[PDB]
Design an enzyme around this catalytic site. Structure first.
Site, PDB file in Angstrom:
ATOM      1  N   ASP A  73     -26.240 -32.621  34.770  1.00 58.26           N
ATOM      2  CA  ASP A  73     -26.742 -33.082  33.720  1.00 58.26           C
ATOM      3  C   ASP A  73     -28.438 -33.637  33.987  1.00 58.26           C
ATOM      4  OD1 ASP A  73     -24.397 -32.751  32.501  1.00 58.26           O
ATOM      5  OD2 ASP A  73     -23.653 -34.786  32.965  1.00 58.26           O
ATOM      6  N   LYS A  79     -31.989 -29.684  35.820  1.00 62.80           N
ATOM      7  CA  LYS A  79     -32.589 -28.482  36.681  1.00 62.80           C
ATOM      8  C   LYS A  79     -33.071 -27.438  36.094  1.00 62.80           C
ATOM      9  CE  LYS A  79     -28.842 -27.906  39.140  1.00 62.80           C
ATOM     10  NZ  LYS A  79     -28.091 -27.202  40.128  1.00 62.80           N
ATOM     11  N   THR A  80     -32.479 -26.983  35.256  1.00 64.65           N
ATOM     12  CA  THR A  80     -32.889 -25.702  34.298  1.00 64.65           C
ATOM     13  C   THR A  80     -34.063 -26.172  33.268  1.00 64.65           C
ATOM     14  OG1 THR A  80     -30.414 -25.101  34.073  1.00 64.65           O
ATOM     15  CG2 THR A  80     -32.189 -24.078  32.391  1.00 64.65           C
ATOM     16  N   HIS A  89     -21.812 -24.660  46.178  1.00 67.10           N
ATOM     17  CA  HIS A  89     -21.687 -24.793  47.648  1.00 67.10           C
ATOM     18  C   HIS A  89     -21.551 -23.472  48.196  1.00 67.10           C
ATOM     19  CE1 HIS A  89     -20.854 -25.766  51.804  1.00 67.10           C
ATOM     20  NE2 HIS A  89     -21.705 -26.822  51.574  1.00 67.10           N
TER      21      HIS A  89
END
Ligand SMILES: C[C@H](O)COCC(COC[C@@H](C)O)(COC[C@@H](C)O)COC[C@@H](C)O
EC number: 3.6.5.3
Lengths: 643, 549
Positions: free
Chosen positions: A293, A296-297, A334
């Site tokens: 949330d 990053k985008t 990950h």
């Protein structure tokens, strides 16, 4: 309402920075009421995340005598699945299920709903207990294949290790039933009346299609049942045959896999960036990492937008500064990043850790950072997002310091880490004051991440593909210069497989011209003084003397292809002995598995210590393939040279 | 005193299958009986049986197997001289081009043939330009692994083509000389002669196939032309490296009936000098003329001055005929208001809209090609292209028994072909199974049990590898013994091998994951020469069993 006080409520609560500022406001400077207000407001926070798809998480198993529980608990990212707080929740749930023999998922849910809400409050992902089940039998066994797959097996006349092996099998081969006969006999007679229509259209005789369908249905039923499956630790015999040999019987089994039957809605990072973007020289690889949330985008779309506006111009994004071309990926998972790194599909020169200043670090933020450490990312830059939604500048300093200390805890230069205070939204809207932050971030990519070393600047190395004896001239090796420059008159070493030998380049040659030198990238013949053809072989390298060494034993990070990727379909175990392909040739080796690992399935990430039948020129970072008779089934990266 | 499984298997593989009569014929007749068809009464019936293009697919599929299965058997005693038969056709085709060369170089009258030539000429020019480019020749010239006038099959490897001086024609000399000037290595010419060598290879039981063996330097340059053409044809949606395109379009045509498959009666020998000169840009034609062999020497010593441009063994023939057939088919489409991207070619094999066929036949007659009506399909349920055969969407590709079944490896190949034809997803059609089990009994006992999964060749019986008592799981990899040709090492030409390597490396839904991994593997392989002794060996290979449902 001082920053000092907010800090106090922070480490007592684990709640976001501004959540504390706010709750310390409508409760006056009363910390205690604040605790309660936030604890009360948790329910709605959890309710708001509740719409989020959560297909990651963990499987858990626990056995106490003849009673066993298997449990699934979900979240959004495997970063959170690894987190200690999430783990504690799930272990607590699991322990409660066993103690009170609770198999009704609703009783379980209802009993932990308060903790769940409080956990979602401070972790910020949609967390939920999904399903829970129990199994009983004469002998109970379990197998965990990491966090993703859990198995319970109940048997009779079988010892502990027999049951364990069966559980391992169930985990790999996913039988639906125990025995062929057990197959819901009414669920296959519709598929037999469906199958014989398919067959009987060729105009092929009644008897023919029926007979063929019948035979098909028989082996289809075999492969879906335990009994009918080739035992994974000895495929030449079925689990049924194994069982008879031990006069044992399988009572029941349960296999859980995280996210089984939950949509699986993949994401197109590059397109989401471009979408968001619309409505509103050296090559360097970077990636964003951080909470789902925290934008990053949004940050990435702001980067592409601002840099294009300012400088003109594997789901990835691209953008340029005056001096560099960047390729940019997201690191939402990950295991996924580790796999991309191993295969060479992805490889960060630097990472941008995105933290929303409205919250500050989440608990899983250490997992985000720990990933960097694990894949050895040289540099991390921090973008503090949503800074426009923060009033007190001293709170920004509070977040900054939390991040720096987290970085230092994992051996990053926390005190010297560039940290930009920006707003992806405000920059994407077009506010210049914030666009300035984007440019500032790109300045740091330019200045803080060193340009990766160019092949031409490395010491000379040519992988030898073939060797020839030219009558009247001497020995010539052929290959592509991998790095550096070889010049006539220079000394070289022949490294690998045999004892290292020395020689002198007496010439460099292409089909059309004789040359004075060979340079990285170029395909050439290199003429050598003195040495005989039978003293050299494919798999050795030509190198500048002293610049590379031969080794037999190394630690590696390995990715094993999945069946669909064209690799193995069965697991392997301790004594696996494939071919390891280094540059130009297969070399035979043995592996040592990590402590506690006993089975490797197709699609796994795993570390192995490899020992080769003979030495090979290598250093840290050398990529290799793993092969079975010329077929590639895996890929590796040399992590540390040993013997 | 050591009969290991490996020695036992080798011993078994080196025995002969002992049987009275024609084993191939017996297998085929038992197969027909099992499907309720009448058997072949005589060897003569084998090669002269026609199927009927009606019935259920099941009926047609076995009926078609019947027409094909012994079609190419090379060991009949019918007194047919399949070589002489071929040379007869070869002379006829040459005489045919003679007529075409004269008619086409011969003077308001209106014609479909001439119009298509005019249209094809213009389109070919846009596609391939004025003259073959230096860049293209540089990228595509190379030696092949086949025979040349100086190198027999055992000296066919490219390393021997650099090692031994090759011949060239008078017109190709300047090409060799330009090559020679561009390198410090020396390139040698053995002789300058305008002759290629004409010979026969097998085709079917009725007739051989005529081919040519070129002077090696000519071939070297022909392959350059071939490579360039192959690149350019991609702009017409034609990929000469991918036969599956035509295969699918054939299947489609058998379902929709809107696509026709057209077989050209070995018109790979009917491409006349005149047609090429009319269709090609002058720069290209000159080069094609430079690099072809103008004359041939027949096995009996007689010579021919070629009326055709070139023949199957030339390194640009396959591509040139693809270009020529495609350009004509596309112009026929334009002329008819059909979409010309509906045209695909793969050498001899043409696919275009069923409506174009009659016009195509007229154009083809006019340019000297002879269309085989029996193998041309523009209606009915059947189509065939590029090795695949379909009847109303159903795969009815047959298999062929080409040789007298002598060794266990021969019999295993036949049994494996039966398996592949008669199974669906590893499950047997009971009718064929019974025949399979019967003839499997002829194998030495051990080779009856030694099975491999499909896709691993034919050195063992296709079946389930997990029940193979000879398979052995070592370090979690299963190894299976298979039969191979026994060979002896020969020495490679050292300098020739070096030039081949140096020349080759200087002449130059995928997931990103397995793409970077593939980049790891070095694709060149050192030259290694062998001669096969006629005996059989055994080799263990790594195997993966079939996957679960
Ligand atoms: C010397 C060389 O490096 C460049 O041209 C050579 C050549 C290029 O093809 C041109 C084409 C037939 O129009 C032949 O040129 C000879 C003419 C002018 O008679 C052939 O190149 C391929 C070799 C060099 O591997």
């Amino acid at each position: 309402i001082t920053a000092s006080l907010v800090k106090e409520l922070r480490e007592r609560t684990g709640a976001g920075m501004m959540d504390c500022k706010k709750a310390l406001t409508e409760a006056n400077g009363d910390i205690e009421l604040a605790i309660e207000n936030m604890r009360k407001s948790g329910a709605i926070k959890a309710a708001k995340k509740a719409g989020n798809v959560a297909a990651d998480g963990v499987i858990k198993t626990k056995i106490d005598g003849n009673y066993g529980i298997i449990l699934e608990v979900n979240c959004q990212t495997d970063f959170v699945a690894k987190d200690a707080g999430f783990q504690a929740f799930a272990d607590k749930v699991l322990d409660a299920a066993v103690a009170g023999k609770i198999t009704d998922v609703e009783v379980l849910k209802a009993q932990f709903e308060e903790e769940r809400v409080a956990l979602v409050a401070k972790i910020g992902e949609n967390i939920n207990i999904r399903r829970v089940a129990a199994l009983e039998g004469d002998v109970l066994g379990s197998y965990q294949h990491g966090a993703r797959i859990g198995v319970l097996v109940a048997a009779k006349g079988a010892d502990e290790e027999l049951v364990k092996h069966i559980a391992m099998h169930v985990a790999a081969s996913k039988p639906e039933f125990i025995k062929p006969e057990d197959v819901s006999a009414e669920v296959v007679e519709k598929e037999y009346q469906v199958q014989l229509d398919i067959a009987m259209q060729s105009g092929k005789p009644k008897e023919i299609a029926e007979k063929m369908v019948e035979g098909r249905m028989k082996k289809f039923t075999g492969e879906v049942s335990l009994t009918g499956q080739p035992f994974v630790m000895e495929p030449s015999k079925t689990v049924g045959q194994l069982l008879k040999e031990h006069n044992a019987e399988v009572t029941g089994f349960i296999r859980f896999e995280v996210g089984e039957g939950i949509e699986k809605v993949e994401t197109d990072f590059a397109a989401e960036v471009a979408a968001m973007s619309k409505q509103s020289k050296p090559h360097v690889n970077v990636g964003t990492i951080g909470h789902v949330d925290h934008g990053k985008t949004t940050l990435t779309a702001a980067i592409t937008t601002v840099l294009a506006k300012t400088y003109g111009g594997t789901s990835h994004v691209e953008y340029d500064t005056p001096t560099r071309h960047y390729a940019h990926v997201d690191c939402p998972g990950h295991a996924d990043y580790v796999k991309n790194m191993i295969t060479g599909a992805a490889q960060m020169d630097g990472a941008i850790l995105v933290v929303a200043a409205t919250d500050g670090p989440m608990p899983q933020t250490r997992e985000h950072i720990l990933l960097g450490r694990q894949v050895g990312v040289p540099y991390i830059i921090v973008f503090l997002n949503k800074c426009d939604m923060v009033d007190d500048e001293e709170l920004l300093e509070l977040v900054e310091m939390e991040v720096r200390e987290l970085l230092s805890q994992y051996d990053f230069p926390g005190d010297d880490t560039p940290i930009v205070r920006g707003s992806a939204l405000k920059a994407l809207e077009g506010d210049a004051e914030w666009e300035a932050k984007i440019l500032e971030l790109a300045g740091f990519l330019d200045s803080y991440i060193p340009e990766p070393e160019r092949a031409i600047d490395k010491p000379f190395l040519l992988p030898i593909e073939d060797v020839f004896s030219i009558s009247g001239r001497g020995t010539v090796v052929t290959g592509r210069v991998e790095r550096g420059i070889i010049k006539v008159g220079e000394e070289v070493e022949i490294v690998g497989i045999k004892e290292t030998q020395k020689s002198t380049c007496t010439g460099v040659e292409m089909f059309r011209k004789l040359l004075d030198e060979g340079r990285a990238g170029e395909n050439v013949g290199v003429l050598l003084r003195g040495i005989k053809r039978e003293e050299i072989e494919r798999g050795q390298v030509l190198a500048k003397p002293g610049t590379i060494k031969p080794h037999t034993k190394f630690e590696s990070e390995v990715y094993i292809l999945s069946k669909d990727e064209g690799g193995r379909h069965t697991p392997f175990f301790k004594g696996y002995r494939p071919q390891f392909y280094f540059r130009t040739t297969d070399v035979t080796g043995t592996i040592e598995l990590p402590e506690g690992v006993e089975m490797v399935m197709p699609g796994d990430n795993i570390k192995m210590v490899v020992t080769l039948i003979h030495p090979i020129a290598m250093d840290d970072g050398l990529r290799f393939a793993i092969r079975e008779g010329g077929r590639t089934v895996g890929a590796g990266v040399v992590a540390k040279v040993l013997s | 005193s050591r009969n290991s499984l490996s020695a036992q298997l080798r011993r078994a593989a080196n025995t002969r299958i002992e049987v009275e009569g024609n084993l191939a014929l017996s297998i085929a007749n038992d197969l027909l009986l099992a499907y309720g068809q009448s058997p072949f009464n005589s060897e003569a019936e084998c090669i002269s049986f026609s199927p009927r293009f009606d019935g259920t697919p099941d009926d047609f599929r076995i009926n078609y197997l019947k027409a094909e299965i012994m079609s190419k058997y090379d060991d009949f005693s019918l007194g047919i001289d399949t070589e002489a038969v071929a040379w007869e056709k070869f002379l006829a085709a040459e005489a045919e081009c003679a007529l075409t060369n004269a008619r086409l170089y011969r003077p308001f009258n209106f014609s479909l043939g001439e119009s298509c030539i005019h249209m094809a000429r213009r389109k070919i020019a846009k596609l391939i330009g004025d003259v073959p480019s230096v860049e293209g020749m540089l990228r595509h010239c190379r030696f092949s692994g086949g025979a040349t006038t100086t190198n027999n099959r055992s000296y066919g490897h490219p390393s021997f083509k650099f090692a031994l001086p090759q011949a060239c024609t008078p017109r190709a000399l300047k090409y060799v000389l330009a090559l020679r000037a561009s390198t410090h290595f020396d390139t040698r010419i053995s002789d300058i002669s305008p002759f290629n060598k004409a010979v026969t290879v097998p085709k079917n039981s009725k007739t051989d196939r005529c081919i040519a063996i070129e002077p090696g330097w000519n071939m070297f340059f022909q392959l350059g032309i071939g490579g360039i053409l192959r690149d350019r044809l991609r702009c017409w949606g034609i990929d000469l490296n991918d036969q599956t395109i035509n295969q699918r379009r054939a299947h489609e045509g058998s379902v929709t009936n809107n696509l026709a498959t057209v077989d050209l009666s070995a018109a790979s020998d009917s491409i006349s000098l005149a047609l090429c000169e009319l269709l090609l840009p002058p720069g290209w034609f000159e080069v094609l003329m430079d690099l072809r062999s103008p004359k041939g020497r027949l096995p009996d010593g007689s010579v021919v001055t070629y009326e055709k441009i070139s023949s199957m063994g030339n390194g640009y023939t396959f591509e040139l005929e693809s270009l020529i057939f495609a350009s004509l088919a596309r112009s026929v489409c334009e002329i008819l208001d059909l979409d010309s991207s509906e045209v695909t070619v793969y050498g001899d094999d043409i696919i275009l809209p069923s409506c174009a066929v009659p016009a195509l036949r007229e154009v083809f007659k006019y340019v000297g090609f002879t269309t085989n009506t029996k193998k041309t399909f523009s209606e009915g349920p059947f189509r065939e292209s590029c090795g695949k055969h379909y009847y109303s969407g159903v795969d009815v590709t047959p298999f062929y028994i080409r040789h007298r079944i002598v060794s266990p490896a021969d019999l295993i190949l036949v049994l494996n072909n039966l398996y592949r034809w008669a199974t669906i997803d590893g499950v047997w059609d009971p009718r064929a199974h019974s025949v399979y089990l019967k003839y499997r009994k002829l194998l030495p006992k051990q080779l009856q049990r030694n099975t491999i999964p499909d896709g691993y060749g034919d050195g063992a019986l296709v079946g389930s590898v997990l029940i193979n008592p000879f398979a052995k799981n070592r370090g979690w990899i299963r190894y299976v013994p298979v039969i191979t040709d026994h060979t002896r090492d020969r020495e490679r030409a050292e300098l020739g091998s070096y030039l081949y390597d140096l020349f080759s490396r200087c002449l130059s839904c995928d997931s990103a994951d397995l793409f970077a991994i593939d980049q790891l593997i070095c694709r060149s392989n050192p030259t290694k020469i062998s001669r096969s002794t006629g005996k059989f060996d055994i080799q263990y290979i790594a195997c993966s069993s079939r996957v679960l449902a």
